[PDB]
């Protein structure tokens, strides 16, 4: 089910369900990040997994995040998506997140 | 494929993959299918024998919990001067599962439900305030709960002859006894209750939208059998329902905005996020902001 | 323990471990082979 | 980088989805914090009339 | 026979000619985490000789008024060599230990040290209701000293500390103690930077004494992680 | 070696020993082993068939005894003018086994424990003093005890909608009934509770030392279902816990100095022996003094 | 008597007479023979 | 079929939908050092997933006047993650590589990059008799740029650079190149801080060109060490 990654002010309704990406003039730039907790309020809360899991207290197992690109056919690009196991701060640079 | 699942699936160890023409991490959301990418194909895994059980998420266990469905307080006293709208030592309740939001939301996670309903009735009593300014004690009253099918004749007064219950099922219980309990069978005229009904239950155009009376379990008429005492009391009756022998069909998106009425799915939302009409999830500063970032 | 004469009076039935998630996760006419491109 | 021609839109959207795998499990059911009420709902009283 | 011993792990070796057997905690030996107890599904890294080797800590001086010393594991080793690097680069850690305590003196010296490995040595504070702070617990390589060894700094008794895996260094008898510790935890793996499975305590029950010419009498601790494995690779915390 | 032991071991008769190179009475404490000297090797013994059972020292029997873990007294009355901190006809308790020292010390004899917890709730009521200067009687009130997992939403008032308990386990019981009883399973996220935890349960440095919330059983919210009477009462609820199906690991030195707080193992000791910081055992005049010497 | 459906509801289990005191009394790699010198 | 490819090593994965097969240098695949070729006698450490994984370097900008870029291995990775830590803590190193170069554009863009792995790319200096210095050769992660790509900065020819293992990124055809490099050295192992076995060179033979709206066109390099092993453990140099 759809994640509400764009859970920010100035994003109203359906706009909160998509993330806008534009051309950049600097390399290795961060686009967005997603917090972890399927318990607290966040982009994962109002999903099937999140809604059902919040009826329970303990959880285990692997998750999957699937991203669909909705640009034009002529649009091209490469992204890198990173999961960082806990312990430190959320990475802010590609060279750290790619580890 | 249909199969018996008792524990979470195991993990198999995996090696390096450099195969041309094989891209398990790529998917096509447009088809409507959920991604079939496995952890073994995304990363190098080890072998894990998973013994975690899945029994607590069974639909039966998920729904077969006694939840409060009705709570009615009324005065047990001499009602000669009581107004017309007051409950004069008895009350009637059209049974519904939409008045208390926890059970309602859990049930509305599904489109169709078939179950029997275990009903538990718990009674409490208190000495009335604003009447006598003293406490004397609590009586061990006898109450009668009669099941009257939807639309049928209901008693009009505490000593009405309708309470003779020649055919209606009636249960007599004391306050000092453990809470009364009876099982009502799955009584729908259809093979399953319609949790949501996109239609009108009348052949004319003035019928109620979204309300199918075939899904209304019935009517509960509760009276105090004892005649009134010289002093007044407040009696509170709570009715709890537990589904059992449950079959469920077509799961649905969970309710997000607060409920407004028991008669419809009307929505307004909270004033601001979370659970607002324009914002369900609480806001963060930006898509690059980590709300609970660990900083050492 | 169920001495009642009506079967619907019995306790809860928590022994149905059968699942078929594919009716919600993969409701497509053509099954998707793992690894191969979907389209 | 995101590289598009002139006639294409210069901003493109991603939609993110999340799901649990079949190694997922849950324990210790509890009342969901996602719903609640501070008063009786409308027409709830009418059930007693 | 039972007095001489050589321990060889990785590129490191230790020889003692005055040992007194050696203790395997609870009769157990360290081992890698089996598949039927594993939880984390990513393939672990097992550095073997790079991390399963003796690291020698800074020696401490046995004085007349010494109350005792303690080191918490893996905290004491978390910034040492390849073990420290793997700890810093991974979220999850698992290993046992091989502890070798060394203290030699002359035949005219007397003294007795209790060398005990305490699992989950949750320390208490003295004469206050406030729990011990982060800096009180996590001393790293240097370790700490016992405030009240008589009660093991936790309201218990030193006299009953022999219920834990332990040896003695009695100067007239032996000059070293050796303890083998398996993985000891409620969970198969743990975050090494916030939880300490073991605490090595060296307590001078009988104080050092002699009438010969006084010399510095150090106590040296060498710890070798065993069957190390790490999970959840990411950037270094440090 | 592992073996089944049901009785204390027997004694075999022994003869004179004058063997060179055999010294069973000598031992080496330095190795950490307990002396293996047998009575047969130290003295001349007879044959004794020992039938003394060892069942009462089984860990299960040692720990599976109902011990008081919580005791809360609160006023059952109209709390319109009650202060914020007062328990207004209900209370909440974060479950812990560290408030009463007997069970706490027994549990702390071990490092790791795995057990299910039988919980028994006993309620008593008294007519309030400093209110009315008279006795009228004791009501047979109905109470609700709801299990709320650690950190989850707890009711804010006696008539809060959170008491509807759609999914939380709730037990309703009367004062006149026998004490309520329910079994809570071993619910730790680990394979065993950590009786002692040498670590911090947070990824930052401000977390609580020695407190692992994974070992907190949960939250008990107890309310009086009955609305308040015109007079006030004092209601006392006692919660007793009995471990069962117990497995224990790594025994520890027993606590000697008196406990100071439920949140840590801080110690002060008594003013003087016994159980003082500088002296656990009570003093005698000298090492040559026999305290209870028999003199005839 | 246990008619509950969950096994953890059962009464106490006081039938485990197995012991291994040597894991605390003799946790040494080399067993000590009776009578012979330890060192 | 031959245009889509997924590479999975350790905890890292890369997917490309516009590949053109991939090149195995000299028809060889990386492998650990066998006993019949080994020289160092100490037991090596083989971190596996901790070091055999994709590390992504900083992207470079493909401009009209770009002459080309180069990175020297293992120098470019010597300070990155667990591979860098193992390199710093060990005297001897051995591994192969898996190189994935990424560059996408639109169907209105044109351009051709030669992506070539040069063994022992001994660089020369221009118009001087002085040999190149240490700082000229060892650029680390950032790499360098070709002064005279026409002669490969060594007096040879770019035209004959196809004798080395190589691919092309032709923007109308493909958006990525993949090269698998085995261990390539006269010795079974080497000191990673003073000798570079391979040099990855990306040279724009056909310059980037289009008449559509201009956008930044980066080139990104991801390198995964393969079959890593290290010998001669000691303190870190760094």
């Amino acid at each position: 089910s759809m994640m509400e990654i764009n859970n920010t002010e100035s994003a109203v309704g359906m706009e909160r369900l998509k993330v806008d990406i534009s051309a950049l003039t600097d390399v290795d730039q961060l686009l967005f990040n997603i917090p972890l907790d399927i318990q607290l309020d966040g982009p994962l809360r109002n999903t099937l997994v999140g809604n059902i899991s919040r009826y329970y207290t303990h959880w285990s197992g692997s998750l999957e995040m699937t991203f669909m690109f909705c640009g034009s056919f002529m649009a091209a690009g490469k992204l890198i998506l990173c999961y960082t196991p806990p312990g430190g701060s959320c990475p802010t640079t590609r060279e750290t997140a790619m580890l | 494929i249909e199969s018996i699942i008792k524990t979470a699936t195991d993990t198999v160890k995996s090696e390096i993959n450099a195969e041309l023409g094989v891209v398990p991490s790529l998917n096509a959301v447009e088809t409507g299918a959920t991604s079939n990418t496995e952890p073994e194909e995304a990363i190098q895994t080890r072998t894990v024998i998973n013994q975690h059980g899945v029994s607590e998420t069974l639909v039966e266990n998920f729904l077969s919990r006694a939840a409060l469905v009705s709570k009615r307080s009324f005065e047990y006293k001499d009602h000669t001067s009581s107004t017309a709208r007051a409950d004069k030592n008895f009350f009637k309740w059209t049974i519904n599962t939409r008045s208390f939001v926890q059970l309602r939301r859990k049930l509305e996670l599904f489109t169709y439900l078939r179950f029997d309903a275990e009903i538990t009735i718990l009674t409490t009593v208190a000495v009335n305030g604003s009447g006598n300014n003293t406490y004397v004690g609590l009586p061990d009253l006898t109450l009668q709960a009669m099941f009257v099918p939807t639309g049928a004749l209901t008693p009009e007064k505490q000593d009405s002859f309708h309470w003779q219950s020649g055919s209606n099922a009636s249960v007599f219980f004391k306050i000092s006894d453990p809470p009364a309990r009876i099982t009502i069978p799955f009584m729908c005229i259809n093979s399953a209750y319609s949790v949501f009904y996109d239609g009108f239950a009348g052949f004319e155009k003035n019928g109620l939208y979204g309300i199918n009376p075939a899904d209304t379990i019935g009517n509960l008429c509760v009276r105090i059998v004892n005649e009134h005492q010289p002093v007044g009391f407040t009696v509170t009756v709570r009715v709890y329902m537990k589904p059992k022998h449950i079959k469920a069909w077509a799961p649905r998106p969970p309710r997000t905005l607060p409920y407004m009425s028991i008669a419809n799915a009307n929505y307004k939302g909270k004033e601001r996020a979370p659970n607002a009409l324009s914002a369900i999830i609480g806001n963060r500063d930006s898509v690059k902001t980590m709300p609970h970032n660990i900083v050492n | 323990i169920n001495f009642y004469k009506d079967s619907y009076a019995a306790s809860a039935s928590k022994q149905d471990f059968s699942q078929d998630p594919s009716k919600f996760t993969e409701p497509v006419v053509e099954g998707l082979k793992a690894g191969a491109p979907v389209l | 980088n995101l590289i598009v021609p002139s006639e294409s839109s210069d901003t493109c959207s991603l939609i993110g989805f999340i799901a649990a795998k079949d190694d997922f499990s849950l324990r210790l059911m509890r009342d969901s914090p996602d719903i609640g009420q501070l008063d009786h709902l409308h027409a709830a009283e009418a059930a007693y009339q | 026979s039972d007095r001489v011993l050589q321990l060889k792990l990785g590129n490191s070796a230790i020889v003692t000619q005055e040992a007194a057997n050696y203790c395997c905690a609870y009769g157990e030996w360290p081992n890698y985490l089996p598949d039927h107890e594993a939880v984390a599904i990513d393939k672990p890294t097992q550095p073997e000789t790079a991390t399963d080797r003796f690291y020698t800590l800074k020696s401490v001086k046995w004085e007349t008024g010494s109350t005792g010393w303690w080191w918490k594991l893996p905290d004491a080793l978390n910034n040492i060599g390849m073990f420290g690097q793997n700890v810093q680069h991974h979220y999850l850690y698992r290993s046992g230990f091989l502890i070798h305590v060394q203290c030699n003196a002359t035949k005219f010296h007397q003294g007795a040290l209790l060398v005990v490995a305490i699992p989950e040595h949750q320390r208490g504070a003295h004469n206050t209701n406030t729990s011990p702070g982060f800096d009180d617990i996590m001393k790293g390589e240097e370790g700490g000293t016992f405030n009240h060894p008589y009660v093991l700094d936790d309201g218990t008794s030193l006299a009953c500390a022999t219920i834990f895996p332990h040896q003695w260094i009695n100067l007239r008898t032996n000059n070293s103690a050796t303890i083998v510790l398996p993985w000891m935890n409620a969970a198969p793996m743990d975050f090494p930077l916030r939880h300490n499975q073991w605490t090595l305590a060296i307590i001078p029950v009988v104080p050092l004494g002699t009438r010969t010419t006084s010399s510095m009498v150090p106590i040296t601790v060498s710890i070798a992680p065993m069957c190390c494995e790490f999970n959840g690779l990411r950037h270094a915390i440090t």
Side-chain angles (χ1 to χ4, degrees), chain A, chain B, chain C, chain D, chain E:
Chain A
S1 38
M2 290 174 240
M3 293 192 288
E4 190 155 305
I5 300 155
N6 194 16
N7 61 309
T8 70
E9 306 210 287
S10 84
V12 180
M14 280 202 294
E15 293 164 2
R16 306 165 75 76
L17 296 184
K18 69 179 172 65
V19 176
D20 279 14
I21 308 297
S22 77
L24 303 176
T25 59
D26 308 305
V27 301
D28 330 331
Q29 291 303 117
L30 168 75
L31 299 178
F32 58 91
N33 50 30
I34 311 177
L36 54 304
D37 242 329
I38 36 167
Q39 155 60 52
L40 257 64
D41 200 8
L44 317 193
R45 196 256 290 169
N46 184 220
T47 64
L48 293 167
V49 47
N51 277 122
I52 299 307
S53 295
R54 273 156 72 83
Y55 278 97
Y56 294 83
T57 321
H58 303 168
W59 72 282
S60 188
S62 302
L63 304 167
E64 70 99 341
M65 280 190 197
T66 293
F67 295 83
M68 178 168 64
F69 178 67
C70 298
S72 72
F73 175 89
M74 299 294 276
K78 298 183 191 278
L79 311 181
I80 181 166
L81 294 153
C82 310
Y83 167 55
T84 301
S89 276
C90 187
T92 60
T93 67
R94 195 177 73 190
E95 55 265 38
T96 294
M98 65 90 167
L99 300 172
Chain B
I1 191 48
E2 175 130 335
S3 51
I4 300 153
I5 308 281
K6 283 159 190 232
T7 61
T9 52
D10 299 340
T11 305
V12 183
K13 66 166 172 73
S14 70
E15 321 289 303
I16 292 140
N17 311 317
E19 226 59 44
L20 287 152
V22 186
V23 281
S25 287
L26 285 173
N27 299 90
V29 158
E30 295 88 355
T31 71
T34 289
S35 162
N36 54 40
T37 307
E38 282 280 273
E40 290 90 333
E41 307 166 310
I43 62 158
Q44 290 203 58
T45 55
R46 66 164 297 157
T47 302
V48 174
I49 309 296
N50 198 312
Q51 309 177 261
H52 295 172
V54 305
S55 69
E56 235 200 307
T57 48
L58 288 169
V59 170
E60 184 86 1
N61 187 68
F62 188 69
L63 291 179
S64 204
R65 313 175 94 77
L68 176 72
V69 301
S70 159
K71 178 163 105 76
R72 193 56 168 189
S73 300
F74 60 100
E75 313 269 272
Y76 169 50
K77 63 173 188 180
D78 190 341
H79 285 277
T80 42
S81 78
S82 269
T83 78
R85 211 86 283 157
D87 292 325
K88 306 187 198 300
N89 303 321
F90 85 100
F91 69 89
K92 182 273 312 187
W93 181 56
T94 304
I95 297 160
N96 73 82
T97 56
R98 284 124 42 203
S99 305
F100 291 88
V101 297
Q102 287 289 336
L103 173 65
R104 181 184 177 165
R105 186 180 194 252
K106 287 166 74 44
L107 294 177
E108 288 181 358
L109 296 180
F110 309 91
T111 307
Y112 298 115
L113 292 175
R114 176 189 178 104
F115 57 86
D116 311 303
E118 190 156 282
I119 306 295
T120 303
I121 306 168
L122 190 162
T123 311
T124 52
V125 62
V127 181
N128 264 352
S130 210
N132 55 25
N133 302 105
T134 170
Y135 173 86
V136 52
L138 303 174
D140 182 22
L141 304 167
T142 290
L143 279 81
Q144 172 186 12
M146 185 168 69
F147 182 65
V148 177
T150 327
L153 287 179
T154 64
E156 78 286 351
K157 62 201 181 142
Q158 176 195 20
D159 55 26
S160 142
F161 279 91
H162 288 98
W163 296 106
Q164 71 186 271
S165 207
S167 288
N168 300 332
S170 268
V171 55
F172 296 83
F173 54 99
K174 302 182 182 293
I175 298 180
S176 63
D177 285 320
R181 181 175 275 174
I182 52 140
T183 293
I184 296 172
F186 171 73
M187 44 60 69
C188 190
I189 62 172
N190 296 317
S191 294
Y193 296 124
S194 296
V195 182
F196 293 88
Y197 187 72
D198 181 26
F200 303 78
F203 279 111
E204 274 169 23
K205 280 162 171 73
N206 74 302
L208 306 180
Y209 176 64
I211 297 290
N212 192 352
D215 301 329
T216 296
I217 303 207
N219 256 26
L220 212 59
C221 308
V222 176
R223 71 158 175 166
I224 289 157
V225 179
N226 303 64
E227 79 197 286
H228 62 83
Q229 316 294 333
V231 303
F233 301 89
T234 303
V235 176
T236 303
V237 168
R238 294 170 162 86
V239 177
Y240 300 81
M241 173 193 299
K242 180 183 88 158
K244 56 172 176 180
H245 318 135
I246 303 158
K247 277 159 75 26
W249 299 265
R252 305 172 74 84
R255 178 88 184 186
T256 58
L257 305 190
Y259 288 108
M260 281 182 86
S261 156
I262 73 155
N264 50 54
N266 288 7
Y267 57 94
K268 170 180 193 53
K270 295 256 170 63
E271 196 152 344
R272 60 185 64 72
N275 302 303
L277 180 51
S278 61
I280 294 161
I281 302 301
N283 288 317
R284 58 177 164 151
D285 293 314
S286 79
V287 299
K288 297 184 201 169
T289 304
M290 182 45 75
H292 297 285
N293 203 18
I294 303 294
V295 184
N296 288 304
Chain C
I1 303 198
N2 177 22
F3 287 101
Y4 302 110
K5 297 180 178 173
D6 297 276
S7 70
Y8 73 85
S11 77
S13 45
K14 295 145 177 264
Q15 63 300 279
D16 181 29
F17 285 98
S18 66
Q19 296 183 15
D20 184 21
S22 74
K23 82 184 48 192
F24 314 111
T25 60
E26 326 197 334
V28 282
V29 66
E30 306 305 277
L32 322 172
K33 301 121 264 92
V38 193
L39 320 162
Chain D
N1 196 25
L2 174 74
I3 302 142
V4 308
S6 294
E7 283 209 281
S8 280
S9 278
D10 63 29
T11 301
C12 310
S13 297
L14 305 166
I15 304 177
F17 305 81
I18 192 161
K21 304 299 303 177
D22 61 345
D23 66 345
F24 190 88
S25 76
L26 301 155
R27 319 193 300 182
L28 219 174
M29 227 192 300
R30 50 150 188 162
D31 279 47
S32 178
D34 287 322
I35 201 78
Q37 76 196 107
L38 287 172
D39 201 338
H40 287 106
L41 307 175
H42 181 87
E45 169 65 17
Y48 300 89
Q49 307 297 274
Chain E
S1 191
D2 78 295
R3 311 266 281 126
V4 307
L5 172 63
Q6 179 155 340
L7 313 168
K8 189 200 85 202
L9 282 88
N11 66 354
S12 69
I14 299 176
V15 288
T16 169
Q17 307 195 61
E18 298 195 63
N21 212 310
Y22 67 79
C23 169
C24 306
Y26 305 116
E28 305 256 323
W29 197 261
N31 59 270
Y32 289 115
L33 174 69
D35 300 329
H36 62 84
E37 310 193 317
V39 164
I41 66 164
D42 60 319
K43 180 178 200 273
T45 185
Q46 290 170 348
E48 294 175 276
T49 58
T51 61
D52 308 345
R53 63 180 304 287
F54 278 111
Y55 303 103
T56 291
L57 310 181
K58 176 182 199 193
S59 300
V60 297
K61 294 184 191 184
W62 190 353
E63 313 286 32
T64 52
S66 286
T67 63
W69 310 261
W70 54 267
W71 297 262
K72 290 186 175 303
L73 299 169
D75 176 43
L77 299 178
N78 275 343
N79 196 37
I80 299 182
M82 285 315 290
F83 179 92
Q85 286 311 308
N86 274 280
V87 154
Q88 281 152 48
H89 289 79
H90 291 87
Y91 161 51
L92 296 181
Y93 146 77
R94 188 191 196 264
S95 90
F97 298 98
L98 217 175
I99 297 171
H100 187 70
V101 176
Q102 304 130 83
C103 180
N104 53 91
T106 80
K107 282 159 155 82
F108 296 111
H109 282 81
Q110 67 185 28
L113 304 165
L114 173 72
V115 180
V116 57
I118 304 163
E120 309 277 359
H121 186 224
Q122 181 186 314
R123 299 177 52 80
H126 169 234
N127 202 23
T128 182
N129 288 316
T130 310
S131 295
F134 187 87
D135 289 337
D136 303 308
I137 303 306
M138 298 275 178
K139 302 295 207 183
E141 195 286 270
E142 289 307 337
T145 52
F146 276 94
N147 306 304
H148 307 100
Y150 185 51
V151 294
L152 293 179
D153 285 12
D154 59 10
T156 61
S157 82
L158 167 66
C160 296
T162 50
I163 193 51
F164 294 137
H166 73 281
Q167 290 207 308
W168 294 83
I169 293 182
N170 192 4
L171 286 186
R172 71 173 263 123
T173 299
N174 59 318
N175 63 24
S176 75
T178 302
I179 302 172
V180 182
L181 299 181
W183 178 247
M184 188 77 179
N185 200 56
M189 293 192 84
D190 216 322
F191 182 44
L193 300 185
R194 288 293 178 273
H195 186 210
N196 288 300
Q197 284 70 49
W198 289 101
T199 291
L200 168 68
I202 300 161
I203 292 155
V205 183
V206 173
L208 177 71
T210 191
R211 280 189 298 176
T212 197
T213 286
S214 39
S215 290
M216 176 180 87
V217 180
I219 298 154
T220 307
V221 177
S222 305
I223 298 163
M226 289 177 79
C227 305
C228 272
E229 54 194 320
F230 308 86
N231 284 72
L233 174 71
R234 44 133 168 76
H235 66 279
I237 301 194
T238 206

